[PDB]
Design a protein around this ligand. Structure first.
Ligand SMILES: Cc1nc(N)nc2c1c(-c1ccc3oc(N)nc3c1)nn2C(C)C
Length: 910
């Protein structure tokens, strides 16, 4: 009632649009989605109330843990005989006095064991306890919890201490872990009880195979076709039947009609039997113009496009009259049709609108049940008869060479072309393929989707298909695999095998592939929503990744409806998110004024305006005392206006400084610095930094300590976003204040015995960025986009472009003598040294490690084709990493390729 109305206002503010706009949507799929999704909301809320208060605290403060407890060899060797030195702080009674207790404990210790040891050291001081029963009432390890000093990260779960990311990071970086002992009841009381209420809207036949008929679709007419009368001669509607990006039959065009009167009224006849239509079949169409001629080949041009699901959400074959409001042609679209394009009607109703009519079969036509499919597949099941088809291989037709051939095919990358000979081969040995589970994506592409006899057999294989790795399953969620049985199998693999660490890692791709789903209500969206509602760390970024795309009308309905369901069940976090949403609003509106109104004024004048506007009461209150959208464990306290400035960079980003209000802020960082950028699309940098993080993780698990710096980057909207400021770092140019300048700077910052570790860190970080940039084809490096930390850690900023931005494989990061001098510890002949030989070996080992994980990088890019990123619009863009990783070539041929690219770039040495 009254509390529902208030909540509706809060959800409305969070998503940008009012809840009422969803209520007025006539589409029954939209209303069914809103109602039916509420079961995910109910389920998630029940899990949070399962073991209160702990399970509610676990939702709010989930353990920031690694996927595997097992520690790499070089990380374990950093420990002192498998032990870690940990500092435990206790805030004692008046004036909030801090007391430290340094403990030496096993790296595999449980937080409760860690708490007991700390209370033993605290009670050791009163030697009364020590000798006789130090136990002190089971030490009430259940009365306390460990918090990370300086941020809102808790150790609420029984994991080994080393598995927590903060501790593993402390081990790797040789930093002292500072934890704070906090009373359980002090945290629990801070945590409010969530009151999930069901909204008011929660109250509101023949088989396809029994239709002995070919497909027909009627094109009636078009409206809002506003073309230049002088230019265009005639127009026509081009159509095609597709399963994903692949045609099921030849494309059918209407007759050419003058643009003045677009009225066709033609029944288009297709090369497909209605029972052979696969579940995910779609009509793809476009209004084209035909001009010219000058005595040349007829001048075709697409004006608008549109795609439609041939089956609706209820498995009903689309019948009757239907009008589709079309979309504008995206720049550089090849064919007259756009099958990769989003299925559905343009929300803008003042756009080309094609009126269609489908066939009618005197009954509601529905897609068959799994019982009908199984029976038909079983009913599809001599030597010479099986020999009549290359797509048939009977019992005792599997030699040892064909078994090894199938294995060889399964190792090939996703972008490798699987020939029609190989497709017949894979399909004929489909039952043996079960024994090599990873081959499924190759087998699926070998299926004739325009044949119900084959598809029905494939459905039964997918049903009883063994599980595959989450990373392998993710490929089955891209645009190439539209079938719900295939995608449902992939989601099942993620439900069973994907950790919340890995889910958080790949959340960007998982949010993206939602766009390829046929319907609003599906297994992927339910999986992701449940996770977002059972883990606030996932939910936070799930919210932002969906909100950052709300300005895109192609996905605003789907994402709006999904965000509504999230907000209705996320609990108290909505109130925190709304603070962030408002803070970002104020920053957008302020930067928009500076970018538009005051762009030509002097820095002093711009700063005067900034300071005045930031000191305004409504602004001040909105922009302080909220959680960092980059990491919501980071509290942003009061603004440090004196430290806040307009940056000299293009798009004139704001450098913002907030106080860290944590009691133990001093043991992490006293001030939180963030760059707010308005003008640039941050999606490409977000994806590169994700790939850098993945590459680093690969190397660290392989036992190659090449330290990367994937700093925080979050796109919050249409070319707006946040960038984590790397503390105590400078560009190469802002070091140069000769060739030895850089090395001399690091010598001064790292004097004495620390020098050797600083040079080592430089060489190791340099090697990682050299390999990473070459593979990814990052934008050309220079003195202003290469940075160095005081400790010697080298890293890059402002990526911009990846893959081929030229449009024959560049070396972005060319090592000048400055870098080689530091590597060779001040040598003259820096090339011929025992330090450079070590550095080269790091690069080779790093290069080959990524080459082994090529299928993952290809797949991560492939799932990102759905996003409108300009340098990632086709699989040919992705093919650049096939070149840099030399996948067609052998491992030794790949080393030679890498060495040759480095030799040509540096003009020798390699
Ligand atoms: C992240 C960072 N840390 C530090 N320490 N300094 C820094 C920076 C940055 C910066 C700014 C905007 C960026 O957009 C992308 N994609 N990467 C960026 C890096 N610039 N500077 C200089 C220019 C002040």
């Amino acid at each position: 009632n009254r509390e529902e109305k208030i909540l509706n206002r809060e959800i409305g503010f969070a998503i940008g649009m009012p809840v009422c706009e969803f209520d007025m949507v006539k589409d029954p799929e939209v209303q069914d989605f809103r109602r039916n999704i509420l079961n995910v909301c109910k389920e998630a809320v029940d899990l949070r109330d399962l073991n209160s208060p702990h399970s509610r605290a676990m939702y709010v403060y989930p353990p920031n843990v690694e996927s595997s407890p097992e520690l790499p060899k070089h990380i374990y060797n950093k420990l002192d005989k498998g032990q870690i030195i940990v500092v435990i702080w206790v805030i004692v009674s008046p004036n909030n006095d801090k007391q430290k207790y340094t403990l030496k404990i096993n790296h595999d210790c449980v937080p409760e064991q860690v708490i007991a040891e700390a209370i033993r050291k605290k009670t050791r001081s009163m030697l009364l306890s020590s000798e006789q029963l130090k136990l002190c009432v089971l030490e009430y390890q259940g009365k306390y919890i460990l918090k990370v000093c300086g941020c809102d990260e808790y150790f609420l779960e029984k994991y080994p201490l080393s598995q927590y990311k903060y501790i593993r990071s402390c081990i790797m970086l040789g930093r002292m872990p500072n934890l704070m002992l906090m009373a359980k009841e002090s945290l629990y009381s801070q945590l409010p009880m969530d009151c999930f209420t069901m909204p008011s809207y929660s109250r509101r036949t023949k088989s396809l195979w029994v239709i002995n008929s070919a497909l027909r679709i009627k094109i009636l007419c078009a409206t809002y076709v506003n073309v230049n009368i002088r230019d265009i001669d005639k127009i026509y509607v081009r159509t095609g039947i597709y399963h994903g990006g692949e045609p099921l039959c030849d494309n059918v065009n209407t007759q050419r009609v003058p643009c003045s009167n677009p009225r066709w009224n033609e029944w288009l006849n297709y090369d497909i039997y209605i029972p052979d239509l696969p579940r995910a079949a779609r009509l793809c169409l476009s209004i084209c113009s035909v001009k010219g001629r000058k005595g040349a080949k007829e001048e075709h041009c697409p004006l608008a496009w549109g795609n439609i699901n041939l089956f609706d959400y209820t498995d009903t074959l689309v019948s009757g009259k239907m009008a589709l409001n079309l979309w504008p042609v995206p720049h550089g679209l090849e064919d007259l049709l756009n099958p990769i394009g989003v299925t559905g009607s343009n929300p803008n109703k003042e756009t080309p609108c094609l009126e269609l009519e489908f066939d009618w079969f005197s009954s509601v036509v529905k897609f068959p049940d799994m019982s009908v499919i199984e029976e038909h597949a079983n009913w599809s099941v001599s030597y010479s008869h099986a020999g009549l088809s290359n797509r048939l291989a009977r019992d005792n037709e599997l030699r040892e060479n064909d078994k090894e051939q199938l294995k060889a095919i399964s190792t090939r990358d996703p972008l490798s072309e699987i020939t029609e000979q190989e497709k017949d081969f894979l399909w004929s040995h489909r039952h043996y393929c079960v024994t090599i589970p990873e081959i499924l994506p190759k087998l699926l592409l070998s299926v004739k989707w325009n044949s119900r006899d084959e598809v029905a057999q494939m459905y039964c294989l997918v049903k009883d298909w063994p599980p595959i790795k989450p990373e392998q399953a993710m490929e089955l969620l891209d645009c190439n695999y539209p079938d719900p049985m295939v995608r449902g199998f992939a989601v099942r693999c993620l439900e069973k095998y994907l950790t919340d660490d890995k889910l958080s890692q790949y959340l960007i791709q998982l949010v993206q592939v939602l766009k390829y789903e046929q319907y609003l209500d599906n297994l992927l969206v339910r999986f992701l929503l449940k996770k977002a509602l059972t883990n606030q760390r996932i939910g936070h970024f799930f919210f932002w990744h969906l909100k950052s795309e709300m300005h895109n009308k192609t996905v605003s309905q789907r994402f709006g409806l999904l965000l509504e369901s999230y907000c209705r069940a996320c609990g108290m976090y909505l109130k925190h998110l709304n603070r962030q949403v408002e803070a970002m609003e104020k920053l957008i509106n302020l930067t928009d004024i500076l970018k538009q109104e005051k762009k030509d004024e002097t820095q002093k004048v711009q700063m005067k305006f900034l300071v005045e506007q930031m000191r305004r009461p409504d602004f001040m209150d909105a922009l302080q005392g909220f959680l960092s959208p980059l990491n919501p464990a980071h509290q942003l306290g009061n603004l440090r206006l004196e430290e806040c400035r307009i940056m000299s960079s293009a798009k004139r980003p704001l450098w913002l400084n907030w106080e860290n209000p944590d009691i133990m802020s001093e043991l992490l960082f006293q001030n939180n610095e963030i760059i707010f950028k308005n003008g640039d699309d941050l999606r490409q940098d977000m994806l590169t930094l994700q790939i850098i993080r993945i590459m680093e993780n690969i190397w660290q698990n392989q036992g190659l300590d090449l330290r990367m710096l994937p700093y925080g980057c979050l796109s919050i909207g249409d070319c707006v976003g946040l960038i984590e400021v790397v503390r105590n770092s400078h560009t190469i140019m802002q070091i140069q204040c000769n060739s030895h300048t850089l090395h001399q700077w690091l010598k001064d910052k790292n004097k004495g015995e620390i020098y050797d570790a600083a040079i080592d860190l430089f060489t190791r970080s340099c090697a990682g960025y050299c390999v990473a940039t070459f593979i990814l084809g990052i934008g050309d490096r220079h003195n202003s986009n290469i940075m160095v930390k005081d400790d010697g850690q080298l890293f890059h900023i402002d990526f911009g472009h990846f893959l081929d931005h030229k449009k024959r494989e560049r070396v972005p990061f060319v090592l000048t003598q400055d870098f080689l001098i530091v590597i060779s510890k001040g040598a003259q002949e820096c090339t011929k040294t025992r330090e450079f030989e070590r550095f080269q070996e790091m690069c080779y080992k790093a290069y080959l490690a990524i080459r082994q994980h090529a299928n993952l990088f290809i797949n991560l890019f492939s799932m990102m084709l759905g996003s409108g990123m300009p340098e990632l619009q086709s699989f040919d863009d992705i093919a650049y990493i096939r070149k840099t990783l030399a996948l067609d070539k052998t491992e030794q041929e790949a080393l030679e390729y890498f060495m040759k690219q480095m030799n040509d770039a540096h003009h020798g040495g390699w």
